[PDB]
């Protein structure tokens, strides 16, 4: 029955494999989008108010149902055919499906003359579709079906195709809503502040933040204030309580202080009462609120109405926005004050801003919902204006012409295309970085980009606290994978078994709590709240309970049985403070864990047995979760959980550590993400090395996707001979690194050989490189289109001619065909022409606008595709193919942060060799190891020697006590090798033995995208910028290198004044001006007629020539634009 330790390493990984058979790696994206389409769009459409318009006749126009068909593309002819994602990629279409809404317009004029007209399936917009979602044409297709459609079966999906560009929505971090968080700002007028970003269940407005603060000590005592929304002045809490109908101080403290035996709380609230005694009735308090507001009505009536509306709608919407909710709002605001007092009295800890239990991940669904709310509101507005301008004339109108569908369509398309998350007009208030271009450089880069999280703290911020690896990231975020540049700690990555909750309605839970012995908050007396336990659901205090323990037992039983409580519902019992917080909302990152009985796992051997035959008896992960054996625990419920790292922790020990565990890790290696799960032996490296590899696995070459032959990507690198690593971890089985690997096993020798590998460089074998070692192919796609925008000027693909075309370069166009497009198989060098495009003029009647190769490439045309774009003019894509043979300067890396460029390449006779004539493919310098402490590199090399000599794949899973260095060495000594991986090598040049026995063996190396040929650049008098006549910027522009301020300072320190003048004047922008010797302002010179005159001074004899930079002339002219007179006085 029990899984014994000897079977555990199989059982756990069997369980893990079942998880990845059920979910995958992009499950969060697909589930978010599916919830958005199934629920969020319908909720948004129904939550909009019916637009009642009347001059008389009236019309309501109620939207009642939505229909999202499959993605479809319509041609000029109008025939209807399904649009496949690959066709969208090739034709630069948007993989979107039409959204139709049912509309009901009832005519009501008078005399009960009512009649309803329903417009079924009114086309309301187009919604882009996430690939492999339920509403994707690739849904449920087999691998054969996907290959029939020219799709990769290993492609995870989880992205959109907007204008042929694959866009991926990055999950955005945000502070959780409807939760009270008591912080303390050191530099502020308030000692403690308790904030609550409140938002109603079905979002319709932004988060309304309410603060309840305490004024810092230094009138008599500490005063509690409340910064309500839409009010620009602090308001005492007692005033707010009275404005809600609680005038008696006893009632207010009944709502705030639940234990009247506690004078400390009492004296700390007393200043607030003493400050609010002149106001003692609800109307006067409402008048005070309205007066403190930023729109103080001259008459107290409208002041009181405004205060009523604010306190009913903007104050704590999550508690309830309807009327008669003042009791719930009063209880909740009293809870906020109670929490603030507990913090000020030291009875509760301040809340941690960085705790991921306090955060939420805004995924594709809830982000598209924000867009859709804004866009549907704008659409209903436009419909209101259109219908108003017609009914004002007293006649009917056609809603089909009122609905301008471009709002929703173009809005979603623009937002996903650019990443600016918001309305196109508010292009600066909008937050960019959402919806990035999917990284297709290697399969690991694609997976990681699809599992990418973002902390929008702002890269400019230099506070390290949000960048720090918090304790609560354990199991939810990769500890290693993070960019090492300016976004350290802000851009994160999901751990492998991390699941972001999609969201759920609290209705069944609330109904069960009602049927259960919970007492509502309006029905109780406050005297009961002392000993009772509060119950919050999605932040709303809904009631109280008397035995929280058996309530938690009941709820956990219900969630483990897949009863009314779904698996993703978090249920935290804080014991010391008697809250029970239940969460069903979306964005809660959680992970699966094995539940533990008294001191035993519930995962018995029968579950492993049924999981082994997963493909026959359809016993899956969901059956494991439904059995009550596995549980999803979120960051906030982990605080109440006692984990076992392994079932070995559940053994009874000579001194028991815990003996009351509640859960167990499925495997600790699941704390790593996609790119860190490729590192072998990451627990033997320094952690920065693991981070650098997690970044560098994403630039590694491989086969980024199986269907690369049909993709017209702008840039693509494919390795000739990708190999799976000889030394692998058990997590790559689910990353599909074995099916799409990104490196080669290289016989690497760590040695000092000729000095060409010093300081992070490598010596490669020229003979190996000749045999296809780390050879790659580079595919570059050029796009072009001939626009017939108007009869004024039209472009067209056609072989240009020297007699008709004007802007025709001296490059030869013979490689083009009569259609103007080069043919595949044609070898093209730099500056060559691949598309001959000519544009009609207003060298006559047509000018050359041909597409050249990006300079200095020298490839062969791989293929040419011609089609029609969305509007329907001819559209061409040409993929050119360039074989990249590794060379000096190309960057290579192992899986341990050990990067370096090729210093030199030696032939096989020049490389050092073992007694059996094995030469290293790569030689790396021993000095790269000691400071870096990448012992995982050495253990991987030794394990790889054992694996190659044994005919297996080494197990480098991080935390594995069945694999240590002594075992690997003992294994290697059985194959006739030195047990530590050393060998006697001979000098290739002289054949003499090397005195020091070299450490050599197979290690998995990666070829990175950074090849020297894509970086080398030179300039000598090339093109210049228009504004300031200085060299351009970039290799692509043939630009010059920037001689910056620091270079100026260095050369000033050198004392090199002529070199400094050469760099900053003569090699950048030499120029001449003519200055009036009297006024010092630039004069008018006419060198052809030799007439120089200053219009200002009315002189034409006292002019002087001045040699100045063009940028300085431009500066002085831009100062004269500002009415400044910079007078260059030559005397």
Q: Interface residues for Zn ion in 1079-1098 (CB under 5 A)?
A: 1079, 1094, 1096-1097
Q: Which of Zn ion, other proteins, none does residue 474 bind to, with CB < 5 to 8 Å depending on kind?
A: other proteins
The reply to whether 924 sits near Zn ion by the rule CB under 5 A is no
The two beta strands, 436-437 and 165-168, are antiparallel
- The least CB distance from residue 1125 to Zn ion, in Å, is 11
* Nearest alpha-carbon partner for 103 in 31, 50, 57: 50
Distance of closest approach, residue 770 Cβ to Zn ion, in angstroms = 14
Q: What's the rounded Cα separation, in Å, for the pair 66 and 43?
A: 10
Judged by CB, which is closer to Zn ion: 421, or 773?
773
Chosen residue from 305, 604, 927, 1100 binding other proteins by CB under 8 A: 927
Site residues for other proteins, window 1-20 (CB under 8 A)?
none
Q: Interface with other proteins includes 942 (CB under 8 A)?
A: yes
From the list 138, 289, 315, 480, which residue makes contact with other proteins (rule: CB under 8 A)? 480
Residues numbered 150-209 forming contacts with other proteins, rule: CB under 8 A: 150
Q: Choose the contact partner of 986 out of other proteins, Zn ion, none; CB within 5 to 8 A by kind.
A: other proteins
777 is a site residue for other proteins (CB under 8 A) = yes
Q: 657 is in the binding site of which of Zn ion, other proteins, none (Cβ under 5 to 8 A by kind)?
A: other proteins
- Parallel/antiparallel/unpaired status of strands 899-906 and 761-765: parallel
String of DSSP letters for 200-268: -SS--S--EEEEEEEE-----SPPEEEE-TT-SS-EEHHHHHHHTT--SHHHHHHHH-S-TT-HHHHHH
Give the one entry of other proteins, Zn ion, none that residue 823 binds, where binding means its C-beta sits below a cut-off of 5 to 8 angstroms depending on kind: other proteins
Where in 341-360 is the site for Zn ion (CB under 5 A)?
none
Q: Does 899 bind other proteins (CB under 8 A)?
A: yes
Judged by beta carbon, residue 77 or residue 323, the one nearer other proteins is 77
The piece of 310-318, 375-383, 845-853, 948-956 that touches other proteins (CB under 8 A) is 948-956
Instruction: Please tell me whether residue 868 binds other proteins under the rule CB under 8 A.
Output: yes
Q: What is the Cα–Cα distance from 86 to 76, expressed in whole angstroms? A: 20
**Contact flag: residue 642 with other proteins (CB under 8 A):** yes
Q: Which stretch binds other proteins (CB under 8 A): 55-63, 228-236, 771-779, 805-813?
A: 771-779
| Nearest approach, Cβ of residue 1097 and Zn ion (Å) | 3
C-beta of residue 1056 within 8 angstroms of C-beta of residue 1050: no
Residues linked to residue 181 through DSSP beta bridges, in sequence order = 195
In eight-state DSSP terms, residue 1065 is I
316 and 333 in contact (C-beta within 8 Å)? yes
935 makes contact with other proteins (CB under 8 A): yes
Residue 901 engages other proteins in binding (rule: CB under 8 A): yes
**Contact of residue 1097 among Zn ion, other proteins, none (CB under 5-8 Å per partner type):** Zn ion
Which residue, 255 or 846, is less far from other proteins as judged by CB? 846
Distance CA 177, CA 318 (A): 9
What x/- string results for residues 57 through 96 when contact with other proteins is judged by CB under 8 A? ------------------xx--x-------x--xx-----
Structure tokens at 803: 């007699």
Contact 799, 831 (CB under 8 A): no
Q: Which two tokens stand for residue 660?
A: 């009351």
Give the 3-state secondary structure of 920-977: CCEEECHHHCCCCCEHHHHHHHHHHHHHHHHCCCEECCCCCCCCCHHHHHHHHHCCCC
Q: Say how many CA atoms lie within 13 Å of 718 toward its Cβ.
A: 15
The answer to whether 590 is annotated as binding is no
Residue closer to Zn ion by CB (options 1079, 1085) is 1079
Question: Which is nearest to 256 in space by CA: 248, 808, 308?
Answer: 248
How far does CA 954 lie from the centroid of its chain? 34
Residues 648, 644: Cα–Cα separation, whole Å: 8
Q: Is 145 in the site for other proteins (CB under 8 A)?
A: no
Q: Is 1076 flagged in the annotation as binding?
A: yes
Cα distance between residue 779 and residue 857, in whole Å: 11
739 binds other proteins (CB under 8 A): yes
Confirm or reject binding of residue 921 to other proteins (CB under 8 A): yes
CA distance 707 to 1032: 38
Residue 865 binding target from Zn ion, other proteins, none, CB below 5 to 8 Å by type: other proteins
Does 540 carry a binding-site annotation? Answer: no
- The entry of Zn ion, other proteins, none near residue 919 (CB within 5 to 8 angstroms by kind) is other proteins
The minimum distance between CB 78 and other proteins, in angstroms, equals: 12
Closest by CA position to 1112, among listed 1065, 1063, 1046:
1065
**Which CB sits closer to other proteins, 300 or 978?**
978
* Of residues 427 and 656, the one with the C-beta less far from other proteins: 656
| Residue 581, marked binder | no
Choose the one of other proteins, Zn ion, none that binds residue 643, judging by a C-beta under 5 to 8 angstroms depending on kind: other proteins
1078 labeled binding residue: yes
User: Does residue 1076 bind Zn ion (CB under 5 A)?
Assistant: yes
User: Which C-beta is closer to Zn ion: that of 859 or that of 981?
Assistant: 981
Q: 344, 268 in Cβ contact below 8 A?
A: yes
Rule CB under 8 A: choose which of 219, 220, 464, 812 binds other proteins. Answer: 464
Return the residues of window 255-274 that contact other proteins according to CB under 8 A.
none
Element (H, E) at 874: strand 874-884
Whichever of 780 and 881 has its CB closer to other proteins, that residue is: 881
Fill in the per-residue mask, 1029 to 1068: x = in contact with Zn ion (CB under 5 A), - = not in contact.
----------------------------------------
| Residue 538 assigned as binding residue | no
By CB under 8 A, the residues from 674 to 733 that bind other proteins are: 681-688, 690-691, 703, 706-707, 709-710, 720-726
Site size for other proteins (CB under 8 A): 244
Half-sphere exposure of 975 (CA within 13 A, CB side): 18
Residues tagged active-site: 760
Contact 541, 333 (CB under 8 A): no
Give, in degrees to the nearest 5, the angle at Cα 620 between 615 and 624: 145
The span of 49-57, 334-342, 511-519, 813-821 binding other proteins (CB under 8 A) equals: 813-821
Shortest CB 534 distance to other proteins, Å = 18
Q: Give the C-alpha separation, 360 to 585, whole Å.
A: 9
Which of 98, 103, 96 has its CA nearest to residue 122?
Answer: 103
Q: Which of 5, 263, 458, 755 binds other proteins (CB under 8 A)?
A: 755
Considering the rule CB under 8 A, would residue 817 count as an interface residue with other proteins?
yes
CB of 329 to other proteins, least distance (A): 29
Residues 1024-1083 that bind other proteins (CB under 8 A): 1025, 1028, 1030-1033, 1039-1051, 1053-1059, 1062-1064, 1066-1069
Q: What does the angle CA 541 – CA 544 – CA 545 come to, to the nearest 5 degrees?
A: 145
Q: How far apart are CA 489 and CA 511, in angstroms?
A: 41
28 neighbors 363 (Cβ within 8 angstroms): yes
State in Å, rounded, how far the first CA of the chain is from the last one: 102
Structural element, H or E, at residue 32 = helix 27-35
478 labeled part of a ligand binding site: no
Residues 1003-1032 that bind other proteins (CB under 8 A): 1010, 1012-1013, 1015-1022, 1025, 1028, 1030-1032
Residue indicated by tokens 């912080």: 183
> How does DSSP assign 819-854, residue by residue?
TSBBPTT-EE-TT-EEE-EEE-----S-EE-PEEPP
List the binding residues: 1076-1079, 1094-1095, 1097
Annotated binding site for Zn(2+): 1076-1079, 1094-1095, 1097
Residues in touch with Zn ion (CB under 5 A): 1076, 1078-1079, 1094, 1096-1097
């Amino acid at each position: 029955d029990e899984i014994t330790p000897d079977l555990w390493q199989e059982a756990c990984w069997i369980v893990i494999s079942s998880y990845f058979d059920e979910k995958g790696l992009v499950r969060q994206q697909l589930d978010s989008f599916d919830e958005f389409i199934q629920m969020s769009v319908q909720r948004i459409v129904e939550d909009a108010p019916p637009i009642d318009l009347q001059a008389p006749p009236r019309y309501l126009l109620k939207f009642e149902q939505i229909y999202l068909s499959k993605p479809t593309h319509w041609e000029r002819d109008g025939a209807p055919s399904p649009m496949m994602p690959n066709e969208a990629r090739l034709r630069n279409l948007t993989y979107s499906a039409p959204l139709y809404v049912d509309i009901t317009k009832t005519v009501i004029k008078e005399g009960e003359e009512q009649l309803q007209t329903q417009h079924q399936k009114t086309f309301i917009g187009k919604i882009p579709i996430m690939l492999r979602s339920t509403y994707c044409l690739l849904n449920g297709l087999t691998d054969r079906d996907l290959c029939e459609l020219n799709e990769c079966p290993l492609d995870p999906g989880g992205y959109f195709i907007i204008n042929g560009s694959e866009k991926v929505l990055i999950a955005q971090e945000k502070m959780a809503t409807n939760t009270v968080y008591v912080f303390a700002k050191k530099d502020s007028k308030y000692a403690y502040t308790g904030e609550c970003r409140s938002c109603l269940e079905n979002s319709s407005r932004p988060t309304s933040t309410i603060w309840v603060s305490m004024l810092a000590r230094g009138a008599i005592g500490q005063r509690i204030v409340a910064t309500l929304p839409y009010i620009k002045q602090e308001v005492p809490i007692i005033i707010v309580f009275r404005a809600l109908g609680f005038v008696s101080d006893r009632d207010i403290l009944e709502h705030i202080i639940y234990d009247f035996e506690d004078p400390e709380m009492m004296e700390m609230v007393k200043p607030s009462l003493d400050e609010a005694f002149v106001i003692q009735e609800q109307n006067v308090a409402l008048n005070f609120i309205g007066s403190r507001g930023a729109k103080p009505g001259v008459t107290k009536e409208k002041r009181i109405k405004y205060a009523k509306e604010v306190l009913q709608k903007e104050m704590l919407p999550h508690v309830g926005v309807s009327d008669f909710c003042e009791t719930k709002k009063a209880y909740f605001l009293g809870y906020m004050v109670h929490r603030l007092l507990l913090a000020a009295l030291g009875r509760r800890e301040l809340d941690d801003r960085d705790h991921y239990g306090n955060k939420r991940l805004d995924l594709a669904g809830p982000l598209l919902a924000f867009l859709f709310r804004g866009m549907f509101k704008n659409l209903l507005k436009e419909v209101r204006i259109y219908a108003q301008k017609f009914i004002d004339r007293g006649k009917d109108f056609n809603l089909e012409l009122a609905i301008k569908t471009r709002i929703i369509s173009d809005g979603l398309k623009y937002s996903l295309a650019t990443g600016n998350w918001g309305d196109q007009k508010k292009a600066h208030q909008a937050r960019a970085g959402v919806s990035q271009v999917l990284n297709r450089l290697t399969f690991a880069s694609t997976l990681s980009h699809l599992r990418r999280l973002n902390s929008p703290i702002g890269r400019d911020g230099k506070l390290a606290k949000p960048r720090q690896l918090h304790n609560t990231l354990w199991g939810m975020v990769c500890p290693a994978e993070t960019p090492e540049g300016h976004a350290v700690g802000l851009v994160k990555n999901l751990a492998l078994m991390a699941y972001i909750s999609v969201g759920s309605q609290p209705s069944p839970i609330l109904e069960f709590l009602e049927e259960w012995s919970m007492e509502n908050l309006e029905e109780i007396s406050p005297a009961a709240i002392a000993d009772a336990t509060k119950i919050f659901v999605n932040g709303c205090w809904v009631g109280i309970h008397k035995d929280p323990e058996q309530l938690m037992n009941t709820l956990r039983k219900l969630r483990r049985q897949m009863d009314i409580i779904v698996s993703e519902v978090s249920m935290i019992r804080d014991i010391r403070e008697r809250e029970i917080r239940i969460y069903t909302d979306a964005g809660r990152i959680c992970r699966p864990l094995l539940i533990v009985e008294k001191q035993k796992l519930l995962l018995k051997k029968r579950h492993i047995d049924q999981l082994k035959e997963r493909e026959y008896n359809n016993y899956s992960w969901q059956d494991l979760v439904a059995s009550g054996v596995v549980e999803y625990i979120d960051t906030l419920e982990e605080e109440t959980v006692m984990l076992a790292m392994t079932p070995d922790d559940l053994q009874e020990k000579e001194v028991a550590y815990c003996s009351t565990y509640t859960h167990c890790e499925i495997h600790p290696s699941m704390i790593l993400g996609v790119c860190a799960s490729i590192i072998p032996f990451p627990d033997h490296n320094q952690s920065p090395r693991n981070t650098y590899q997690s970044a560098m696995g994403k630039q590694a070459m491989g086969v980024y996707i199986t269907n690369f032959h049909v993709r017209m990507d702008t840039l693509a690198h494919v390795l000739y001979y990708p190999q799976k690593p000889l030394v692998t971890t058990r997590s790559m089985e689910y990353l599909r690194f074995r099916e799409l690997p990104a490196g080669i096993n290289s016989i690497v020798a760590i040695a000092s050989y000729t000095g060409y590998n010093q300081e992070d460089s490598v010596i490669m074998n020229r003979s190996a490189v000749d045999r296809g070692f780390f050879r790659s192919v580079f595919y570059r796609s050029y796009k072009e289109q001939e626009s017939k925008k108007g009869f004024d000027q039209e472009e067209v693909f056609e072989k240009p001619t020297r007699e008709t075309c004007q802007g025709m370069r001296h490059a030869i166009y013979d490689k083009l065909d009569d259609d103007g497009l080069i043919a595949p198989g044609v070898r093209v060098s730099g500056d060559d022409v691949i598309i001959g495009k000519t544009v009609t003029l207003p060298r006559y009647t047509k000018r050359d606008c041909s597409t050249f190769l990006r300079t200095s490439e020298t490839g062969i045309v791989d293929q040419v595709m011609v089609t029609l774009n969305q509007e329907g003019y001819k559209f061409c894509k040409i993929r050119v193919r360039s074989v990249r043979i590794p060379q000096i300067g190309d960057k290579f890396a192992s899986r341990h942060g050990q990067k370096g460029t090729c210093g030199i390449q030696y032939r096989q006779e020049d490389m050092p060799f073992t007694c059996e004539g094995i030469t290293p493919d790569i030689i790396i310098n021993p000095h790269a190891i000691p400071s870096r402490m990448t012992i995982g590199h050495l253990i991987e090399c030794l394990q790889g020697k054992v694996s190659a000599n044994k005919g297996e794949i080494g197990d480098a899973t991080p935390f594995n006590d069945a694999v240590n260095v002594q075992k690997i060495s003992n294994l290697l000594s059985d194959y006739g090798y030195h047990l530590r991986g050393n060998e006697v090598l001979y000098n290739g040049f002289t054949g003499r033995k090397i005195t020091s026995q070299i450490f050599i063996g197979p290690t998995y190396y990666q070829r990175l995208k950074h090849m020297v040929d894509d970086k080398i650049h030179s300039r000598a008098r090339g093109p210049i910028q228009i504004l300031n006549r200085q060299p351009m910027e970039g290799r692509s522009r043939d630009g010059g290198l920037r001689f910056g301020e620091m270079e100026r300072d260095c050369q000033i320190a050198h004392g090199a004044a002529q070199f400094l003048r050469e760099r900053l004047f003569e090699a950048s922008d030499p120029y001449q001006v003519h200055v009036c010797n009297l006024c010092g302002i630039m004069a008018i010179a006419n060198t052809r007629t030799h007439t120089y005159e200053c219009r200002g001074c009315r002189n034409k004899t006292q002019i002087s020539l001045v040699r100045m930079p063009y940028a300085c002339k431009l500066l002085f002219q831009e100062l004269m634009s500002m009415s400044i007179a910079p007078r260059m006085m030559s005397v």
